[PDB]
Amino acid sequence: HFHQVCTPAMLAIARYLGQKVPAALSDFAVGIYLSILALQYQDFAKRYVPEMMNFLLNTLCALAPERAKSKLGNFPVHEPPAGIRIKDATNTPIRQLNCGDCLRKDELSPAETSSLQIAILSTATAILKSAADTWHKLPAFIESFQPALSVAQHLLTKPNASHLPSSLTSKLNDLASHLSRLLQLSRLSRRPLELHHHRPLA
Amino acid sequence: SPTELTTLMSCSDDKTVRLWDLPSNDPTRLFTGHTDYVRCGAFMPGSANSNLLVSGSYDETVRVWDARAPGGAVMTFKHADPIEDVLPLPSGTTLLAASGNAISVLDLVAAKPLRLITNHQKTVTSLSLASQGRRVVSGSLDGHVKVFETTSWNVVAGAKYPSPILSLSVITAGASHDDRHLAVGMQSGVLSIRTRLS
Amino acid sequence: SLVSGEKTNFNHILRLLNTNVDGKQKVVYALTQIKGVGRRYSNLVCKKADVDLKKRAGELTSEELERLVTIIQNPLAYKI
Amino acid sequence: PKWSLAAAEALCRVFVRLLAAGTIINWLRDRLSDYDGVLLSMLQSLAVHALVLAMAVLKAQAQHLTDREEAIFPRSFFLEIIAVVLESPIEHLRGHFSENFVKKYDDIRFYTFEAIKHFLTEEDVRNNVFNLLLSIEDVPESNDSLENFFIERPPKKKHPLLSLSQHKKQAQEAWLAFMHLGLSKEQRKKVLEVMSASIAPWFTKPEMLMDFLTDCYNSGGSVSLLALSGVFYLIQERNLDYPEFYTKLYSLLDADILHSKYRSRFFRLLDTFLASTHLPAVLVASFIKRLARLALNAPPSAIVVIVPWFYNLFKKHPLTTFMMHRVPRTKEEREKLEKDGLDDPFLPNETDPMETRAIDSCLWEIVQLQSHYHPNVATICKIISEQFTKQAYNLEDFLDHSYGSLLEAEMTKEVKKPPVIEFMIPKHIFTKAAPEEEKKDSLLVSLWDFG
Amino acid sequence: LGTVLNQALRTDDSDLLESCLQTLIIQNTINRMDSSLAGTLLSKLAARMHRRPGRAFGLMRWIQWTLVAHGGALVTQPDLINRLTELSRVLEERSRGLSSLLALKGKLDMLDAQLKYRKALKMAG
């Protein structure tokens, strides 16, 4: 429940994760790192991290094939300032993240940015998969993961699938089918609240 | 009740209006049908309208019930605003529902609204009848009282108070009911009585 | 649709010098609830502080409440 | 030039002595017009003491440059002093002027305001005048609250220096001249912050502020969040109205308001906007359900503000407490509800709060926020779960919490009561597979390549 | 002052209307005023100009800028031309008496010219 050292680290992850509009791709990478670290904090103590949720959906819309038009969750959607978004490079395959992406490089090549951005999108799809599987309880599942399904369906559109490879389409369609199954599960399992069933005093 | 001495009515905060009689320890009749707070209501004056009740709620509905059949409302009028005040006219035919920035005169003989009258900026709080049943004085949160005719419903006169007013009545002297003085109760906590003596 | 409810929260338990329970009763019947304070004593306290007997407890401002808590400490400083 | 400063403090003493004492007189009246430029050049040097000289020479010129008993002191020379003070790039010059005279005296306040109006009628200088206009925070309450004048407290009994409406009139006129010139972005976002405590109580009539406030409030963004306090002050004092106030509040509280910095001022205003007695249950339930579905993505320094406010609203309006304890009354509804699950009948992104169906919904969002990672947020989300014993929760104990406070909360305790650690630590913290141990890998390692 | 003027002309106030009339500002006010309250403003300006003759300059300025700004806004109304008719009546009464008043102005200008001449002599003497 409460620790003197453990949960202040969770609060440090929290302060970096809820705030900090990202200014480069290094901030994206460090945010993905603290998101998976906070998942590992909240494994088999099935708690909820709202800032992990809104940050992951922020990255998933801020990699921005076309634009976040309207009605993409209740999370704060922010601006990719310096062209921090995916371009039409569908031939750079997925890769696993290294730690050097916690360094800023203004002189980076676009063929070096594209693999990194596709990597960030693929690993964020994996984090949404793990977060859904560990949070299929917790009865605001539907109200927390309807933006996940909606942004995934937004990335499965025709002005958005040209810039993505078929592997990212496969990962995001696995996300779509998995979240649709989990959402039908939570809709059939949702019961109305009866909190105040009190034993009268004698 | 304006005719019987022991019958009274109650609009409560939950959903209910209900008729009590003074000797009994039980409400004689119960009327449900509102979906929000019901906060203004009156009996219907008239020789033919012996037992009819009107109340408006905060669900933007004015309902008028027959007290003989305690089912639903006999007639229902849906407005656009949380209905603050209700008064019937002394002929018993028409009815003024004060909802938001407008009052509304409705018929009860043929179940049709006559006219929406908007002349206040903030929400109208309290209606009152005046001089001889001929002029309706309405008071709003704008700090305004305004007196309308009852035949054509034009703004005949008005006045302005230093606070948003909450209750308003012109009250009568005695025989033939000449109006003695108009009292306004305001949000500031003041009752301003303005007296006319003839 | 906006009338000030700045006074409508008054029927709650107030805290004072010794007793932690002092709800709304009146202004002089609320003073009897404090231990050592009497029924004839409580009327002398109210005539000095310009508080009216008509009001209740809880109908007083944050300035007017503490004026009765100073004068309950020293009954000699205000003449008696 | 310290000896020139010494000559200045000597010549000022000589001037005030000859004035307080008093073809031959024209040079005696040439003296001060020749000394004016001397002090004007000395106000651009230390000019901190030269300002004391420049505000003693005005006292002498008021006291004895006339035959009348009335002290008439030169607004034109004071205007030139204002024009060099508000132009000089020194900060401590204007600081000494603001602290020692303007916040202290009243003649300087009134004539400073009218000199500023003239000087602004005729961008760095704009920032300087704005930083001076923000300086006079305090507003006098009554005519007998003025009661300390620098020169000639008037015996007129109806003088514009003795009527508070004329002090407020020239303050309003200076502010209108500045806002007619037009203000920059950070200037506007300072004005709308400090308006309802320091700007609007300077006006005789704030009705032009009504149009400014309703423009910048109907605009959108965070500037409406700033302008809400001004709009509330102008509905309060002189009851100009906003047309659809509660639907504007319902459109105002939205996706990214809870992450802003001004949410403490906003919630301190919402605590008065939703303490009104003429609120329907549908509206006060809609403002709970949207602030719960918005609390799903809120900071832990925001949920601690939201949930005691929910508790006060649930104590005040008991018809909304069916969003916590709703019983299916009919067993047919029980059979339907166990056959197919219940869809939430709340309608998000609906325009009007009286037609959002927040009634018949529940606070699944709060009962899910009970499993928050923070212990204090997890135990304050239990006040809805446990029992309604305390009659009200004050919000000033729960407001102004931030991450700095939440992270110094783990600092201001003991160093360590002796904590626990985790036994059976695996040796493959970073190894990618570890197939001979049967313990599944860290997902950190399954999704990060360390090599 | 547009929304304040809208409120005053829409709920027939006097305090708000007078406190916004006693005061650039006028041009912005009439340009941000609603179109439907322009005839109400014309009638409520004609009334004050009849009831009080000393306020003619500011009230003619207000009427002038209203007729500039909302000209066709009064033509799309057109069954309410009677407000312009009462306005024409008030301005006809204001412009009554002009030839005799010019004659009397000349008869007084001669006296003022002689008094100023004798003051110009008496200052130099």
Measured torsion, CA atoms of residues D224, D225, D230, D231, in degrees rounded to the nearest 10: 60
Interface of chain B against chain E, CB under 8 Å?
A: 119-121, 142, 144, 146, 155, 158, 160
C-D CB pairs within 8 A amount to: 27
Cα–chain-centroid distance for residue D210?
18
| CA of E8 vs chain B CAs: smallest distance (Å) | 9
- Distance CA(D242)–CA(A6), nearest Å, equals 50
Q: Give the three-state DSSP class for A97.
A: strand
- Beta-carbon contacts of B105 under 8 Å, excluding residues fewer than 6 positions away, are B94, B95, B96, B113, B114, B115, B117, B153
Q: Is C18 within 8 Å of C65 (Cβ atoms)?
A: no
- Beta-carbon contacts of D108 under 8 Å, excluding residues fewer than 6 positions away, are D55, D101, D102, D150
Phi/psi at D67 (nearest 5 deg)?
-90, -25
- Distance CA(A178)–CA(C74), nearest Å, equals 74
Nearest to C1 among B82, B166, B187 (CB): B82
Q: Of D73, D76, D191, D177, which is closest to residue D117 (Cα–Cα)?
A: D177
Tell me, letter by letter, the H, E, C secondary structure of D277-306: CCCCHHHHHHHHHHHHHCHHHCCHHHHHHH
Q: Of D190, D189, D194, D196, which is closest to residue D210 (Cα–Cα)?
A: D196
| Angle CA A30–A34–A35, to nearest 5 | 115
Q: Do B158 and E7 touch (CB under 8 A)?
A: no
Residue D413 sits at the chain C interface (C-beta within 8 Å): no
Q: Is D73 within 8 Å of D61 (Cβ atoms)?
A: yes
Counting as contact any 3 or more CB pairs under 8 A, the partners of C are B, D
| Angle CA D293–D298–D303, to nearest 5 | 90
Q: Is D373 within 8 Å of A47 (Cβ atoms)?
A: yes
Strands B112-117 and B17-21: unpaired
- Distance CA(A93)–CA(A81), nearest Å, equals 25
Q: Is B18 within 8 Å of B32 (Cβ atoms)?
A: no
Identify all chain D residues contacting C5, using CB atoms and an 8 Å cutoff: 275-277
Long-range pairs of D380-388 with CB within 8 A, sequence gap ≥ 24: D380/D303, D380/D304, D380/D307, D380/D308, D381/D303, D381/D307, D383/D307, D383/D308, D383/D311, D384/A195, D384/D307, D384/D310, D384/D311, D384/D314, D384/D324, D385/A195, D387/A198, D388/D311, D388/D314, D388/D315
Over its C-alpha atoms, chain C yields an Rg (Å, rounded) of 13
| CA of D92 vs chain B CAs: smallest distance (Å) | 46
- Beta-carbon contacts of C60 under 8 Å, excluding residues fewer than 6 positions away, are C27, C51
Q: Where are the beta strands (DSSP E) in D103-167?
A: none
Residue B122 sits at the chain D interface (C-beta within 8 Å): yes
Nearest to D325 among A40, A47, A194 (CB): A194
Give the position of tokens 């015996």. Answer: D155
Number of other CB atoms surrounding residue B91 within 10 Å: 12
The helix (H) or strand (E) run that includes residue A80 is none
Q: Is B96 within 8 Å of B76 (Cβ atoms)?
A: no
Tell me, letter by letter, the H, E, C secondary structure of chain B: CCCCCCEEEEECCCCCEEEEECCCCCEEEEECCCCCCEEEEEECCCCCCCCEEEEEECCCEEEEEECCCCCCCCEEEECCCCEEEEEECCCCCEEEEEECCEEEEEECCCCEEEEEECCCCCCEEEEECCCCCCEEEEEECCCEEEEEECCCCCEEEEEECCCCEEEEEEEECCCCCCEEEEEEEECCCCEEEEECCC
Identify all chain D residues contacting A40, using CB atoms and an 8 Å cutoff: 442-444
Q: DSSP assignment of D325-387, as one string?
A: B----SHHHHHHHHHSPPP----TT-S-TTTS--TT---HHHHHHTSBSSHHHHHHTTTTTS-
The H-assigned helical ranges of D122-253 are: 124-133, 164-181, 185-191, 195-198, 207-219, 222-236, 245-252
D107-121 and D164-181 helices, crossing angle to 10°: 30
Chains C and B touch (3+ CB pairs under 8 A): yes
Q: Do B121 and E12 touch (CB under 8 A)?
A: no
The experimental method, as deposited, was: cryo-EM
Over its C-alpha atoms, chain B yields an Rg (Å, rounded) of 17
Q: Extract the tokens encoding D430.
A: 């970073």
- Beta-carbon contacts of D194 under 8 Å, excluding residues fewer than 6 positions away, are D134
Strands B83-88 and B135-140: unpaired
- Distance CA(A38)–CA(A9), nearest Å, equals 9
Q: Is A112 within 8 Å of A54 (Cβ atoms)?
A: no
CA of D305: how far to CAs of A185, B96, D258, in Å? 33, 43, 10
Q: Is B40 within 8 Å of B55 (Cβ atoms)?
A: yes
Nearest to D391 among C6, C8, C13 (CB): C13
D-E CB pairs within 8 A amount to: 24
Q: Extract the tokens encoding D164.
A: 């508070």
Give the position of tokens 């230390």. Answer: D46
What single DSSP character describes residue D395? S
Q: Do E7 and D180 touch (CB under 8 A)?
A: no
Q: Do D211 and E2 touch (CB under 8 A)?
A: yes
Q: Give the three-state DSSP class for C27.
A: coil
Q: Extract the tokens encoding A192.
A: 């109305």
- Distance CA(E46)–CA(E49), nearest Å, equals 5
Strands B112-117 and B179-186: unpaired
Dihedral class, residue B60 (left if φ above 0, else alpha if ψ from -120 to 50, else beta): left
Q: Extract the tokens encoding E101.
A: 């008043």
Identify all chain C residues contacting B141, using CB atoms and an 8 Å cutoff: 2-3
What single DSSP character describes residue D101? I
Q: What's the half-sphere exposure (Cβ side, CA atoms, 13 Å) at A200?
A: 1
- Distance CA(B11)–CA(B38), nearest Å, equals 6
Do you know the residue count of chain E?
125
**Substitution target from E3, E6, E11, E17 for chain B, most B beta carbons within 10 A:** E11
Q: Give the three-state DSSP class for D450.
A: coil
- Distance CA(D20)–CA(D12), nearest Å, equals 12
Q: Give the three-state DSSP class for A194.
A: strand
**Substitution target from D241, D244, D286 for chain B, most B beta carbons within 10 A:** D241
Q: Extract the tokens encoding D312.
A: 């006060």
Q: Extract the tokens encoding C32.
A: 């009897």
Q: Give the three-state DSSP class for A26.
A: helix
Q: Is B147 within 8 Å of B124 (Cβ atoms)?
A: no
For B:41-100, CB contacts with D below 8 A are: 58-60, 82, 84
Cα–chain-centroid distance for residue D135?
14
For D:30-89, CB contacts with E below 8 A are: none
- Distance CA(D315)–CA(D308), nearest Å, equals 10
- Distance CA(B20)–CA(B55), nearest Å, equals 16
Q: Find the distance separating the first CA and the last CA of chain D, reported in whole Å.
A: 70
Q: Find the distance separating the first CA and the last CA of chain A, reported in whole Å.
A: 33
Q: In what order do the strands lie in the sheet with B191-195?
A: B165-172, B179-186, B191-195
Q: Do B160 and E12 touch (CB under 8 A)?
A: no
- Distance CA(E72)–CA(E68), nearest Å, equals 9
What single DSSP character describes residue D439? P
Strands B52-57 and B155-160: unpaired
Q: Extract the tokens encoding E67.
A: 């007729």
Q: Is D211 within 8 Å of D203 (Cβ atoms)?
A: no
- Beta-carbon contacts of D366 under 8 Å, excluding residues fewer than 6 positions away, are D292, D295, D307, D310, D381, D384
- Distance CA(D283)–CA(D356), nearest Å, equals 8
- Distance CA(D397)–CA(D408), nearest Å, equals 16
- Beta-carbon contacts of E24 under 8 Å, excluding residues fewer than 6 positions away, are D180
**Substitution target from C2, C4, C7, C11 for chain D, most D beta carbons within 10 A:** C2
Cα–chain-centroid distance for residue D233?
13
Identify all chain D residues contacting A195, using CB atoms and an 8 Å cutoff: 324-325, 367, 384-385
- Beta-carbon contacts of E81 under 8 Å, excluding residues fewer than 6 positions away, are E74
Residue E119 sits at the chain B interface (C-beta within 8 Å): no
Residue type, D402: S
- Distance CA(D243)–CA(E32), nearest Å, equals 16
Q: In what order do the strands lie in the sheet with B7-11?
A: B7-11, B17-21, B27-31
Burial E5-42 (b: 16+ CB within 10 A, else e): bbbbbbbbbeebbebbbeeeebeebbebbbeebbbbbb
Residue type, E48: R
The helix (H) or strand (E) run that includes residue A1 is none
Nearest to C4 among B82, B100, B187 (CB): B187
- Distance CA(B144)–CA(B140), nearest Å, equals 6
Q: Extract the tokens encoding C48.
A: 């000095």
- Beta-carbon contacts of D148 under 8 Å, excluding residues fewer than 6 positions away, are D105, D106
Q: Of D256, D400, D295, which is closest to residue A79 (Cα–Cα)?
A: D256
The strand pairing partners of B140, in sequence order, are B124
Number of other CB atoms surrounding residue D233 within 10 Å: 19
Q: Is D305 within 8 Å of D267 (Cβ atoms)?
A: yes
| Angle CA D309–D310–D312, to nearest 5 | 65
Cα–chain-centroid distance for residue A19?
15
Chains A and B touch (3+ CB pairs under 8 A): no
Cα–chain-centroid distance for residue A37?
13
The strand pairing partners of B155, in sequence order, are B148
Q: Give the three-state DSSP class for D159.
A: coil
Q: Find the distance separating the first CA and the last CA of chain B, reported in whole Å.
A: 31
- Distance CA(D411)–CA(D404), nearest Å, equals 11
CA of D419: how far to CAs of A40, E79, E114, in Å? 20, 86, 108
Q: Give the three-state DSSP class for C39.
A: coil
The helix (H) or strand (E) run that includes residue A69 is none
Measured torsion, CA atoms of residues D36, D40, D45, D47, in degrees rounded to the nearest 10: 80
Q: Extract the tokens encoding C69.
A: 């808590």
- Distance CA(D351)–CA(D353), nearest Å, equals 7
Identify all chain A residues contacting D443, using CB atoms and an 8 Å cutoff: 36, 39-40, 130
D124-133 and D164-181 helices, crossing angle to 10°: 150
Q: Of D405, D367, D398, D407, which is closest to residue D302 (Cα–Cα)?
A: D398
Residue B131 sits at the chain C interface (C-beta within 8 Å): no
- Beta-carbon contacts of B190 under 8 Å, excluding residues fewer than 6 positions away, are B163
Q: Find the distance separating the first CA and the last CA of chain C, reported in whole Å.
A: 50
The H helix count followed by the E strand count for chain D is 21, 0
Q: Is A76 within 8 Å of A65 (Cβ atoms)?
A: no
Identify all chain C residues contacting D272, using CB atoms and an 8 Å cutoff: 4, 6
Give the position of tokens 């209307």. Answer: E17
Identify all chain B residues contacting C4, using CB atoms and an 8 Å cutoff: 187
Q: Is B15 within 8 Å of B1 (Cβ atoms)?
A: no
E38-51 and E82-94 helices, crossing angle to 10°: 30
- Beta-carbon contacts of D2 under 8 Å, excluding residues fewer than 6 positions away, are none
Counting as contact any 3 or more CB pairs under 8 A, the partners of A are D
Number of other CB atoms surrounding residue A131 within 10 Å: 23
Residue D390 sits at the chain C interface (C-beta within 8 Å): no
Q: Is D438 within 8 Å of D425 (Cβ atoms)?
A: no
Phi/psi at D99 (nearest 5 deg)?
-75, -45
- Distance CA(B185)–CA(B191), nearest Å, equals 4
